[PDB]
Structure formats: C-alpha cells, structure tokens
Design a protein around this ligand. Structure first.
Ligand SMILES: [K+]
Ligand SMILES: [K+]
Ligand SMILES: [K+]
Ligand SMILES: [K+]
Ligand SMILES: [K+]
Ligand SMILES: [K+]
Ligand SMILES: [K+]
Ligand SMILES: [K+]
Ligand SMILES: [K+]
Ligand SMILES: [K+]
Ligand SMILES: [K+]
Ligand SMILES: [K+]
Ligand SMILES: [K+]
Ligand SMILES: [Mg+2]
Ligand SMILES: [Mg+2]
Length: 1326
RNA sequence: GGGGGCCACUAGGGACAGGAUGUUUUAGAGCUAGAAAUAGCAAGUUAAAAUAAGGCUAGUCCGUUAUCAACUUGAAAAAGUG
DNA sequence: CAATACCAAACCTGTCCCTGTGGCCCCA
DNA sequence: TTTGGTATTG
C-alpha cells in the first residue's frame, strides 16, 4: 500500500489530501469513541484544518513597555513625596493622604474631600487665584515670597509627572530667547561673506514672520517677499529654508557638482561633505542658520516674550487661558445677540459638538472647530475668531495633543527656577535641589533595559553592586559599560565558520581591507602584447590600494585604467574584467579617520592596527558620547584635543559577517599566512575567500570543520525568519503530516507535495509627504489627500509620480484618472508582480513602446532624468528605476525571460525551503552504505500558479466563497500534479525535490505542463497521445481518459474533513474603555475596592473557555436546591483562579454539589451536532457560530465560476453557450441554498428576504445575478454570522444568542485532521 | 550548481528607553424663582489618582506573543491509544 | 427568551539587532 | 476589519 500526501500551507488554513497510485483518495472506517451508538464512521482522506490568525508580539510589547512607564512615573512621584515627607508632615500631616484618595467618593474618603487645603474656603480661594496649574507654576517661578509647601509640591509634581520629551541633547535656552537676534546674526555673517552682495534686513520683522503659526514654506515666502531682489532659492533663501526645517539644495548657490541637500532633521555628514568643497569662511554661516532654526522651533512652543518671565511655557499656557476666556465671552455675547435660538445647543448640549460637548462631552478640538466654523461665518464680528480657528488657536485648552513638542528642558527650567526661589526658605529644598532635578531628568538608557534582578526574561542589565537602584545612584550601581555591551552582543551573531569568535564591526578597518582585497584579487586585465588575461600580483594589488583606495573613497574602473595602468604600466588601452563601473568595496573608515586625525602614516602603520580596531569597535559598540569618551580616554595621549573631540562625535552602526580570527587569525600550517595574507598575495592563483576556505591543500577548511559545533520542533519553527502566522501554519502542517502517517499504519508516503500561499495608509501618506517635500512640489498644497484615499491604486501612483505621466514629460489630471492606465514595467506575462514596485501610472500604455519587453529605448532617453528625480525623492525604489531603465542595458534578454518563466513554477522562497527541510529530515532518517541519506520520501515544492493553471485549463474551477473545501481540493491537486510531474520528468527532481540555450529552456519551462493536454496549439498546432508514459521506464503517468474523471470524482465528493482548530482565547481581559458608573453587574472593578456602581469600570470581558457545569443552584427566597446544566464562561481574568481550584470557584459563583468529573472544558469553536446533521460551534458561553459546510455540487460550482466571469474566441463562446444552456442552474442553486438554510442555518427572516431579493432581480443580467449568488453564501458559510448584500439589498446577520440547545446535543472532539472523533451525548447528563 | 562574501535598494520579525492625549471618580461652594418637575441666567480651559484584576520572586521586576481535540498512565513533563 | 442596534484606545519620538527578495561582481 | 458583549424593546 503506497500513497502520497498533498499539502497547502496558508496563514489561516492547512489543506491536506492523501492520494494513491491512480491519484484516487482513499476512504477508511475510523473508530469512534464516547457514549453514543456510533462505533465508527467512514471518512475520506482529504480535508483542511482552519484556525484563527497567529499574532505578532508587537501589541504585547507595547502594553508591557507602557506598563513599565506607568510604574516608573508612579515611582518618580513617590521619590518626590519621600523627599517632601517630614516638612510636609510639619505643614499638613494628611496632604499626601488626601492626594492619594482623591479618586474616592466622600463616603469612602477618610479625610476631608478638598485635597490641597482640607477646607472649602481655602480651596475655592486657590482655584480663584490659580485657575490652572500653570498660573501657580508661573507665580512660583517669578515671585520672591515664601510659598505654601503644598503648592510647591503641586507645581514640582506637575512638572515631574508630565516632564516633556528627551529628543534634544544638552541644555536649552543658550542665549537665544528670541528670533530677531539670530536672524540679525545670520544677516551679519552673510554680509560678511558677500560684501559685494549685501542684504538690507532693516525694517524686517523676523520675529513675527518666522514665529507665525504657518507652514515653513509660507514663512519662507513671507520673509523673502520682505527682501527685494532676493529670491526663495538663492543662498539666503536656502539658509532660511534650512532654518525653517525644509530640505533646500545648496548646489545651485555655489555652482556645485555634488548635490548639497541639507535638512537639519545624515546632516552632520552631509554638511561635512559639502564643507569639503568650499572649506574656509562658510562654516559659521551655517552655524548661524542652525541657531535660527532652533529659535523658530522654540517660538513654536513659547509664544510669549522671554524677558518678562522665567516661565515662558507657563506664561504661554496662561496666554491660551486668557484668550480662551476673552473669546468665550465674545462668542457668548455674539450668539446671544445674533442667534439667540442656538445658544443652548452650543453651550448646554453635550451630545452636540459645541462648547458643551467640547468641554464636558466627547468632542475634540477638531470636531468643535468643524461644528462652529459655519456658525462663525454666518455671524458678524467673527473674523478674528475665524483667523484663530484656521490657525488652530481658538478656545484652546492647556492639556492638548500637540503639547508633545515641549522638551523636558523647559519643564526643568521652570522646576529649577522654583527650587531656586524656595530653597531660600526651606533647607531641605536646598539640600535636595539636584535630587529633584535628577528625578525629572533621569531616563533609564535604552541600552540598559529593565532594572531586573534575575526574574525578567527581557533584562540583560548587570549591576556593579547589589542594592536598590535609584535615579541618584544609577551610575554607581549599574554597570553601564557591561550593560551597553551586552545590549549589542546578545543580538549580534557569531562567525558561522568559527562559532565562538565574535564578528567584526562592519566599518572595521580590517574588515574593509578584507572586502577590498577579496574583490580586487579576482580582477583581470588584458592589453595588446598579452596572450591571456592575468591576475594582479600582490605588488600590483598593494600599489592599487595605496594609490587609489587610500586616496579616493570610491575607485572607478576609469581611475583604475588611468591612474594606475597608464601612469604606472604605461598602457594606453587596457581591458578590465571582474569589475564594472566602480569597485563595490571601499576603505571608508580609512578616509573617515584620515579626515579626523590627519595622520596618514599613522593609519598605514600596522603597529597601531590594534588601537584602531579598538576605536572603531567602541564607536560601533556604543552610541552614548560620554561612554565613547570614557572608552577612548586610554588614547587621549595620542591625539590632539580637536582630533579627540572630532572622534567622539563619529559613530558607526552595523556588524560584519566574519571574525577577526578568521580574516587575520588562523594561519595555514605550511605557508604560515592568514586569510588576508592569501588575499593580498597568493602567487598566480589569487584564491578568494570561498576557494581559500575550501582548498584541501590548506589547513583553513579542517580548522573550520573542527571549530564548528538541540532544538525542539516548536523551537526550530519559532526561530525561523517569517511572519508568526505562517509559522503557526507550518507547525500545524507538521502535526497534520504526523497524524496522516499514523492513519496509514505508520507507513511513510512516497511523496509529499507542499505549496505555500502568497502573502498602511499612514505609511503611504508619509512616503508621499516626504517625496513631495524633498521634491519641492506644490501639488500637495493644491491637492490635499487623506491617508484612506491613498488606498486607491491610481491616486497613490498619481502622487508618487508628482501628478505626471511616467512615460511622457507631461502633466496629469486627478479628475481624469479613470481614463489613464496602470502598466507593468516588466510585463506581467514574464513577472507576475502586481505591486507598486512594478506598476506605473501613465496616460496610455501605448506610450511605453512595445508590450513584449521593458519600456523602449526612446522612452528611457526621454524620461530617465525625471525617473531619477522621482527616485531621489524616494517616490520610486531602486528596483523600479532599474526595471524602467533596463532598455539602456540591453533590455530583457532571452535568458531573462527563461528565468522569469522558470520562477513562475520553481519555488525559491526560503521559508518554503525550511518547511521542505523540516519534513524531509522528519521523513528520511536512515543512511546507506556510503553513509548518505536514504530519501524514502520525496518532498516536492510547487508554486500556486501550477495548480491554478491546471484548474483553469481543465475546468476544475474554485470559488472561495462557496465553502472551505477549496483548501483540501488545492492540496489534492497539488499532490496529483506534483507526483505526475516528477513521474513524467524524473530529471526535474533537482528542481522540485528537496535534497542534493535560453530559447531552449524558455520553450521547455513554458511547455512543461503540456503533457496533461490532448491537443496543444502553441505558435503551430500539435497533438499528444491519450496515455502519457515515462520515456525510459515505460511506466504510465497520466491516462487522459480515466484520470481526469478521477479528479472530477474526488472534487465532487461531499464529505470533506473541515476542522476548525479549537483555541482557548488569550489576550486582554476585556474592552479597554473605562465606562462611567452604572447600575449593572456587567461592570468590572478597575481596582479591588472600586465599586463600579460608584466608580465605573470595564465590561465586555473575553471568555477564555466555557465550562459545562452540572450542579444545583439555590432558587427563590427559600434557597431550594434545583438541578441545572448550563454553560459558565470563564473570563480570561478568572482563568487562573478557576484553574487553581475549580470547585471553590464554581461554588463562589453559586453552584452547589458540582459533579467534578462531569466538568467539560469547551474552548472556542467547540463542535456540537444536533438534529438533521445541523452543527454549531461555540463562539462563546452564550453565542454560537454556524458549524456546517454547504457541499455545493461541482456542476453548480463550475457554472457559478464561468457565469460570474470569475481565452480563445471559440472556447469563450463555448463557455458562454454552456452558461446560457444551463441558466436553470440559477434556480437550482437557489433551491440548494434554501434547503441547506432550512435544514441548518435556520434564519427564516433572512432566508425569506433573500428569496424575495432573488425573485426581484430575475431580469438582471446573468453575470450580475451570479456574482450576487456568490454573496448569498455568506448566509451559509461556516463560522460567525455576517451581513451581506444582494445587489442593493442588505441582509443583516442572524445571530445565535443562546447556547442552551448544545447542552443536550452531541459534543464532537476532533483530532487535528478530524479523522479521529470522540462524540459525547450531552443529553445523558443531568 | 543547493550555498557564501560584497554593493545599491526595498518587504517580514524582535527588544528596549521615553512623550503627548484619552477615559474614569473626586475637588474646583453655581445663583434666582418656584412645593416639585422645571424656567431664566451664570460658569466651563485645571488638578489628584488609576490605566489591564493583580503576582511573589518584592525587582524602580513580572502580568495580552508563542503553545492547546479526546482518553489511559503520569504530580507534571510526557509518552501511549483507533 | 428573541431581535436590533450600537460599541469597540489611539497618536508619536529615539537606540539597536536579525532574516528575506533581488538586480549586479566574484566564488563553492 | 470582524465579531462577541451590552442595553433596549417587546
Ligand atoms: K517602537
Ligand atoms: K467621610
Ligand atoms: K523679492
Ligand atoms: K472632550
Ligand atoms: K559594480
Ligand atoms: K553606534
Ligand atoms: K485571538
Ligand atoms: K492564543
Ligand atoms: K479609552
Ligand atoms: K548572495
Ligand atoms: K512597501
Ligand atoms: K463638577
Ligand atoms: K482540535
Ligand atoms: Mg499597577
Ligand atoms: Mg490627564
């Protein structure tokens, strides 16, 4: 008994089928367990496992980190309170107690209900004096009087609990404090550089213009209009644009070659690049520019002069409050006079988006502005209010979403000011000033992680001493060096060849020397007199490195031909091979360090090698400039302070893939030279890295094998590189294979054919914004778009093309997108790529050139520079540009077309290879006489296009919406096609079986599947035999008279084992919304003592799994015991408690005399069978999902495919004629559905509405009726009910809101395939 | 030629350090007429605390990813059963 | 009960690591 | 988005 297995791996399904020699699917009698009269059941060996999508760990990580942030903010507040404790107890012994219980109702409060002062008079007086906390903050910053210690604490705690961001390094307010001075300084340095061309900035109000709340380009345009004869793209205009945050191009200002694109948000290296060109005199000007940028950015936040207060942030918040009060008074009076009938709706109705809903309801600032703008325009005297509205500065709150701009240095400034003011009166404030400042300023460094003590699987921090870590002892306790080192080392891999040696930093001088020599050793050259191309000698390589690679960042073939061959070897003409255009490798770190230290002989001396290797290591291993300085301190005696200061600023990222002990460590026994020594000089062999480590005449290979040195199935799958969903699918696939082998008497299959399925608007908006602002285009200003709109392909392409045709240098129209074309760069007949990377928006595809290849040479000549512009704006990826410009490189060769066609059939994804390797190592385990693996089971891998084209060519159509059978059918067809293909052409095994002339292969791989067809009309016409056999063995592979009927019969089988994977629900406890208080037991307490009737809380908890409880409950005021059998849902939160002791939990819920052995655990999707084969699945403890599949006959499936328009003229006509001849199928299909629905679905209202809808549109075209019949199957689909639409009628989901019936139905436990069952008659309980 | 190093580019994962909102209860004395409903007016911008219940291992740590049909034997971890 | 309509926590900064696809150079 | 919880309405 022989057989093969077909598998179909997806993100939510694994289809499986077993085939025999005749491509038939067996059927067995499987034993049935339980308490029913059923002792066995007949099963076809075909089916599909279904499961919910596997989830990433991202949301869990975000929740975890936010948890930690909340804990540590609470800890900051606790630190501050511990500092204040004794003196606050002297002032008010219950202040912090009233603060802690501020949330409680007065009934539960143990102290007075007024927090700050404990009596109503002082509280109302405070609130009248300081209506916002920022009033108190400004008062405590400015005033000189001794203040109440409680108000001091309130200010400092408001600053610490909400402390602003840490994106800016260093300190703030360094001079500056105004824009006018820095604009004046920029004008002064400009006039210093251009005495002949000065700028008259007199009468120019830079403060208002550059601090005005307008777009950067608009403030640019304003300031430039203020200066006549100076344009926006001149030098001064570009400096002001750089200050405003734009990306100006300084190339045209200095007649440059290198594109001097500068954005102050790579800028250090970009500016050093540009500064290399015009070195002296031009650095201080850009210094002034960046300073002006900082001033404008701060003016965005501080909207009050900084000379009347040391609390400009609090003063700006008070400005917000005062303008809010004034504008609210004016708006109230205006509405009272002009539209008095609307006043109530605006100022009393929380449901509307007026001021009532704005302050008390749920309306946002945006919703309120939208609600009130029409009212403002309809009235008189609202022009200034509309100005403040369109600038988003009307009736502003102080606690808003845009406060994220506030850096922590400003809050720290106000905190330090208050501490300086009040430490004169409180000695403990003087002694703890820096402590409180540190509380505000201290972050745990990202390279340190959780400050754990051996109970966190996420932590890596090592501590210098065993004691509690505080913000003040962090450096003394935490080993920041070892922690920052472990941060990188636990994530970087080791040398694969030497698994114990760490890999080198990517920018290591040794590593780049290695790469350069390894590329250079394979270069070959020819001249006239030479008989044969020769390698470069060690001397020639050293000369090229010392002359070209050590004097230019990049070395072109031009530089190699001219600066070496002509100058040294005196070769007027030389032909170079092994390199094209320029060398890929380069000694970048060499030149970085040459610019920083300016001592070339130091860099060339090998004595300093180690030192240099360490420095780079430091610069790569750490990012904190202070730790970099501490590590480089041991070299402070070797470099001038300028060089050291320039060095500690230079940092590197990334790691190599080989170790230092591999490059320049291990040596060959006889030659005594390392790998790098071989790369530099190796006589006339010039062996490269692969050859060097694979040469048996050398000791490197055996040392690698000697140095080279257990995981479970789940561990191995979890460590794969892929999405977690497909990994869940892979694990389920392996489990299915194991169970299927057990079904076949432990016999291993002949073959296993596997196929793996092919696997945001904010990112599109970000791409388009960055590309357009890098492009300097006004199309975004003239055409506003929302992120959702970018889900349209043509509009996204329009904005990615700056509103132009791509094949012609002409304007495009948004309104005319329905008339334009979306073309494939490389034609889809070669590369089945439908992504934005291979698609393009043009006016007409005809303008691409010929449709049989890449865009023509003419279109390339015309459009290449526009394409490069779109590429630099990152509106085009490099691959898209290269496929567009392929024509200038020869276009598509015949080899390229052959490779594209082979790609469509031969799977080369790595994840599929890993699935194949797992299954292959699981099936084949024995070794032969030569100790080579015995391949009993051939693991074949196919691409979906094979079986797709098979279905379409032999009318084995699939319709996904009818049911889930198509997964199992795909697995079956995979098994059949794969086995038949490798039987017909065994030589293709190396292509399709895991383990170990362009026109010819094009034709071959195009016609690989023709052996299934009887006649093949490939342009002329040819025909094939009825029986297809192997050429050598003479064995039969395909009988076109009998085997196609076998496939039809297999696909028509109604009994297919569809199994929905039962899963305990995990995740959050309940819905996240904190609901207001309500008289309902559905509310869940947010804290142990917070009675939800008083404090509100959560509802809508998730049921981890239900439990069948058979027990008794008290009834009536008599508490009389009454036997019950019902479904109790255990919420996720309750699950641990319920599992620690189920009897105590159930008795706590009210059940008595619980029959402990009759407790049945029922996870989600638990299957129940009732009457007439009707099946339900457990959606919850109180709701059910549809549990039955509609096995629609194959004739109706193919009719629905063809009629709905889901080729040759004669064949299209034959299919249309078949559709019209079998129009009655329509009614028949309806009938089928109806019967199914009346037997299983039981939705009388929905079914009647659907029948009326079908009888309403009987005059509609057949195609439309068919594609609506496709929608109809949502009523009958397995799983959760859902709403659908028949033409323009909407059918709402009929839900199953009661689970009482399944308590007497038959519970079905299914193995992973569903072949093994256990059926429990629940009627026999209770 | 499965594989490997490099260069240019873009998809799929993982971890950590932080920010600004949101929500919830309470505090911010509403007034006047009315028995009451209710009417007329005034006011509104702020703060505290919580932000998965909580856990022990008590850390300025952990608490939403992964994994799970049933049954026998097992404390589990496991194997085994048609 | 049965049916119906409504509801659902979101945004952002920075540091770093990895594998993967895919055009090119060189090899095993 | 999809889909299970919730309060209303009979
Ligand atoms: K993040
Ligand atoms: K009380
Ligand atoms: K001008
Ligand atoms: K609101
Ligand atoms: K190159
Ligand atoms: K670094
Ligand atoms: K889930
Ligand atoms: K789960
Ligand atoms: K919320
Ligand atoms: K490669
Ligand atoms: K993308
Ligand atoms: K109130
Ligand atoms: K199962
Ligand atoms: Mg907590
Ligand atoms: Mg808040």
């Amino acid at each position: 008994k022989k057989y093969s297995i077909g598998l179909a791996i997806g993100t939510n399904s694994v289809g499986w089928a077993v085939i025999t020699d005749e491509y038939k699917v067996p059927s067995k009698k499987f034993k049935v367990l339980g308490n029913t009269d059923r002792h066995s059941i007949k099963k076809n060996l075909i089916g599909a496992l279904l499961f919910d999508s596997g989830e990433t760990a991202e949301a869990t990580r975000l929740k975890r980190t936010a948890r930690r942030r909340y804990t540590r903010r609470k800890n900051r507040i606790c630190y501050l309170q511990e500092i204040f404790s004794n003196e606050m107890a002297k002032v008010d012994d219950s202040f912090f107690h009233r603060l802690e219980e501020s949330f409680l109702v007065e009934e539960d409060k143990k102290h007075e209900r007024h927090p700050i002062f404990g009596n109503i008079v002082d509280e109302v007086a405070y609130h009248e004096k300081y209506p916002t906390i920022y009033h108190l903050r400004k008062k405590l910053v400015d005033s000189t009087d001794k203040a109440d210690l409680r108000l001091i604490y309130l200010a400092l705690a408001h600053m610490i609990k909400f402390r602003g961001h840490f994106l800016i390094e260093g300190d703030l307010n360094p001079d500056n404090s105004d824009v006018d001075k820095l604009f004046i300084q920029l004008v002064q340095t400009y006039n210093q550089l251009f005495e002949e061309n000065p700028i008259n900035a007199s009468g120019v109000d830079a403060k208002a213009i550059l601090s005005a709340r307008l777009s950067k380009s608009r403030r640019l345009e304003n300031l430039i209009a203020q200066l006549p004869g100076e344009k926006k793209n001149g030098l001064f205009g570009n400096l002001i644009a750089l200050s405003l945050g734009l990306t100006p191009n300084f190339k045209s200002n200095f007649d440059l070659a290198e594109d001097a694109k500068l954005q102050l948000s790579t800028y250090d290296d970009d500016l050093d690049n540009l500064l290399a060109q015009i070195g002296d005199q031009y650095a201080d000007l850009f210094l002034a520019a960046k300073n002006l940028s900082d001033a404008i950015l701060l003016s965005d936040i501080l909207r009050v002069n900084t000379e009347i207060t040391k609390a400009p942030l609090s003063a700006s918040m008070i400005k917000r409050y005062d303008e809010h009060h004034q504008d609210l008074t004016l708006l109230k009076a205006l509405v009272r006079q002009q539209l008095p009938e609307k006043y109530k709706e605006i100022f009393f109705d929380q449901s509307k988006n007026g001021y009532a809903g704005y302050i008390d309801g749920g309306a946002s600032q945006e919703e309120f502005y939208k609600f009130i703008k029409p009212i403002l325009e309809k009235m008189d005297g609202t022009e200034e209010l509309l100005v403040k509205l369109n600038r988003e500065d009307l009736l502003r709150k102080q606690r808003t979403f845009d406060n994220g701009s506030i850096p922590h240095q400003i809050h720290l400034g106000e905190l330090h000011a208050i501490l300086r003011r009040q430490e004169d009166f409180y000695p403990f404030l003087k002694d703890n000033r820096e402590k409180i400042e540190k509380i505000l300023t201290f972050r745990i460094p990202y390279y340190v992680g959780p400050l754990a003590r051996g109970n966190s699987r996420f932590a890596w921090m090592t501590r210098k001493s065993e004691e509690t870590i505080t913000p003040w002892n962090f450096e003394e306790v935490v080993d920041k060096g070892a922690s920052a080192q472990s941060f990188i080392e636990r994530m970087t891999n080791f040398d694969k060849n030497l698994p114990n040696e760490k890999v080198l930093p990517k920018h290591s001088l040794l590593y780049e020397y290695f790469t350069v020599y390894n590329e250079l050793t394979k270069v070959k050259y020819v001249t006239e007199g030479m008989r044969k191309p020769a390698f470069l000698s060690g001397e020639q390589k050293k000369a090229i490195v010392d002359l070209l690679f050590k004097t230019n960042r990049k070395v072109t073939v031009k530089q190699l031909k001219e600066d070496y061959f002509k100058k040294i070897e005196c070769f007027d003409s030389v032909e170079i091979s092994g390199v094209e255009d320029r060398f890929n490798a380069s000694l970048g770190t060499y030149h970085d360090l040459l610019k920083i230290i300016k001592d070339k002989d130091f860099l060339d001396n090998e004595e300093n090698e180690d030192i240099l290797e360490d420095i780079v290591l430091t610069l790569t291993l750490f990012e904190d400039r202070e730790m970099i300085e501490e590590r480089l301190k041991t070299y402070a005696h070797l470099f001038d302070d300028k060089v050291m200061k320039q060095l500690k600023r230079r940092r590197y990222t990334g790691w190599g893939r080989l170790s230092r002990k591999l490059i320049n460590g291990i040596r060959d026994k006889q030659s005594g030279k390392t790998i790098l020594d071989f790369l530099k000089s190796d006589g006339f062999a010039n062996r490269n890295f692969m050859q060097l480590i694979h040469d048996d005449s050398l000791t490197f290979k055996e040392d690698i094998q000697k140095a080279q040195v257990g995981d479970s199935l789940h561990e191995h799958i979890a460590n794969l590189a892929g999405s977690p969903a497909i990994k869940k699918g892979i694990l389920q696939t392996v489990k299915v294979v194991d169970e299927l082998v057990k079904v076949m008497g432990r016999h291993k299959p002949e073959n296993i054919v596997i196929e793996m399925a092919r696997e945001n608007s904010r990112e599109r908006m970000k791409r388009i914004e960055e590309g357009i602002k890098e492009l300097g285009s006004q199309i975004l200003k003239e055409h506003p778009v929302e992120n959702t709109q970018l889900q349209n392909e043509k509009l996204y392409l329009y904005y990615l093309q700056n509103g132009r045709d791509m094949y012609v240098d002409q304007e495009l129209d948004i309104n005319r997108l329905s008339d334009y074309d979306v073309d494939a760069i490389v034609p889809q007949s070669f590369l089945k790529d439908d992504s934005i990377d291979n698609k393009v928006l043009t006016r007409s595809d005809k303008n691409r050139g010929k449709s049989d290849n890449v865009p023509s040479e003419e279109v390339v000549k015309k459009m290449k520079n526009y394409w490069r512009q779109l590429l630099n704006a990152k509106l085009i990826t490099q691959r898209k540009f290269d496929n567009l410009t392929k024509a200038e490189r020869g276009g598509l060769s015949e080899l390229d077309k052959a490779g594209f066609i082979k790609r469509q059939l031969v799977e080369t994804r790595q994840i599929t290879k890993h699935v194949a390797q797992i299954l292959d190592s699981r099936m084949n385990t024995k070794y032969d006489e030569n100790d080579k693996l015995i391949r009993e089971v051939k693991v074949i891998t196919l691409k979906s296009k094979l079986v797709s084209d098979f279905r379409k060519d032999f009318q084995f159509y699939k319709v996904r919406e009818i049911n889930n059978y198509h997964h199992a059918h795909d697995a079956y067809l995979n098994a059949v096609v794969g086995t038949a293909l490798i039987k017909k052409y065994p030589k293709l095994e190396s292509e399709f079986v895991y383990g170990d002339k362009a026109t010819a292969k094009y034709f071959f791989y195009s016609n690989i599947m023709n052996f299934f067809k009887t006649e093949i009309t490939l342009a002329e016409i040819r025909k094939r035999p009825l029986i297809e056999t192997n050429g050598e063995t003479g064995e039969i592979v395909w009988d076109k008279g009998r085997d196609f009927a076998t496939v039809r019969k297999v696909l028509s089988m109604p009994q297919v084992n569809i199994v929905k994977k039962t899963e305990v629900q995990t995740g959050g406890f309940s819905k996240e919304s904190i609901l207001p208080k309500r008289n309902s037991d559905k509310l869940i307490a947010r804290k142990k003592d917070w009675d939800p009737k008083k404090y509100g809380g959560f509802d809508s908890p998730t049921v981890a799994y239900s439990v069948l409880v058979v027990a008794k409950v008290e009834k009536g005021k008599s508490k009389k015991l009454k036997s019950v059998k019902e479904l109790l849902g255990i919420t996720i939160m309750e699950r641990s408690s319920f599992e620690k002791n189920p009897i105590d939990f159930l008795e706590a819920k009210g059940y008595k005399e619980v029959k402990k052995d009759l407790i049945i655990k029922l996870p989600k999707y638990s299957l129940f069978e009732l009457e007439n084969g009707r099946k339900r699945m457990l959606a919850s403890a109180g709701e059910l999902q549809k549990g039955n599949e509609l096995a629609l006959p194959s004739k109706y499936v193919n009719f629905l495919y063809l009629a709905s328009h889901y080729g040759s003229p004669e064949d299209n006509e034959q299919k249309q004629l078949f559709v019209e001849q079998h129009k009655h199928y329509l009614d028949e299909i309806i009938e089928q559905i109806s019967e199914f629905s009346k037997r299983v679905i039981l939705a009388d209202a929905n079914l009647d509405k659907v029948l009326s809808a079908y009888n309403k549109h009987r005059d509609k075209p057949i195609r439309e009726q068919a594609e609506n019949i496709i929608h109809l199957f949502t009523l009958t689909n397995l799983g959760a009910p859902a709403a659908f639409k028949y033409f323009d009628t909407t059918i709402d989901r009929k839900r199953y809101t009661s689970t009482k019936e399944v308590l007497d139905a038959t519970l079905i436990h299914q193995s992973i395939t569903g072949l093994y069952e256990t059926r429990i008659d629940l009627s026999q309980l209770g």
